[PDB]
Amino acid sequence: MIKQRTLKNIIRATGVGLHSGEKVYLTLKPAPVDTGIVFSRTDLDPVVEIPARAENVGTMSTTLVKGDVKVDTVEHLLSAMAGLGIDNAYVELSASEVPIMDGSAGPFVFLIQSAGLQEQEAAKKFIRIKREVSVEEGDKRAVFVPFDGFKVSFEIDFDHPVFRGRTQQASVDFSSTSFVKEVSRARTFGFMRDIEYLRSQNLALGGSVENAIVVDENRVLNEDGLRYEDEFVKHKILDAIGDLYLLGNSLIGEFRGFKSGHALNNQLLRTLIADKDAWEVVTFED
Ligand SMILES: NCC(=O)Nc1cccc(OC(F)(F)F)c1
Ligand SMILES: [Zn+2]
Q: Is 1 exposed, middle or buried (0-12, 13-18, 19+ CB in 10 A)?
A: exposed
Question: What is the Cα gyration radius of the chain?
Answer: 18
Residue 239 among known ligand-binding residues: yes
Measured from the CB, is residue 212 less than 6 Å from ligand 1? yes
Which among 214, 278, 211 has a CA at the least distance from the CA of 247?
Answer: 278
In one-letter notation, the amino acid at residue 150 is F
CA-based angle 99:101:105, to the nearest 5?
Answer: 100
Which among 233, 245, 199 has a CA at the least distance from the CA of 74?
Answer: 245
Contact 257, 240 (CB under 8 A): yes
Q: Is 204 exposed, middle or buried (0-12, 13-18, 19+ CB in 10 A)?
A: buried
Give all strands (DSSP E) within 124-162, no chain letters.
126-129, 133-137, 140-145, 150-156
Cα 204 to ligand 1 centre (Å): 8
Task: Spell out where the chain is interrupted, by the residue before each break (C to N > 2.5 A).
Answer: 58
According to the entry, how was the structure determined?
X-ray
Measured from the CB, is residue 103 less than 6 Å from ligand 1? yes
Annotated active-site residue 262? The verdict is yes
- Going from the C-alpha of 76 to that of each of 146, 179, 205, 258, 275, the distances in angstroms are 25, 13, 18, 20, 27
Write the DSSP assignment of 91-121 as a string of letters. Answer: EEESSSB-B-TTSSSHHHHHHHHHH-EEEEE
Paired sense of beta strands 37-41 and 48-51, if any: antiparallel
Contact 187, 212 (CB under 8 A): yes
Per DSSP, helices labelled H in 25-166 are 75-84, 106-115
Paired sense of beta strands 150-156 and 250-258, if any: parallel
Q: Determine the Cα–Cα distance for residues 128 and 125; give it in Å rounded to an integer.
A: 10
Measured from the CB, is residue 263 less than 6 Å from ligand 1? no
Sign of CA pseudo-dihedral 262, 267, 271, 274: positive
Contact 255, 236 (CB under 8 A): no
Which among 79, 99, 83, 76 has a CA at the least distance from the CA of 26?
Answer: 99
Q: Determine the Cα–Cα distance for residues 9 and 117; give it in Å rounded to an integer.
A: 8
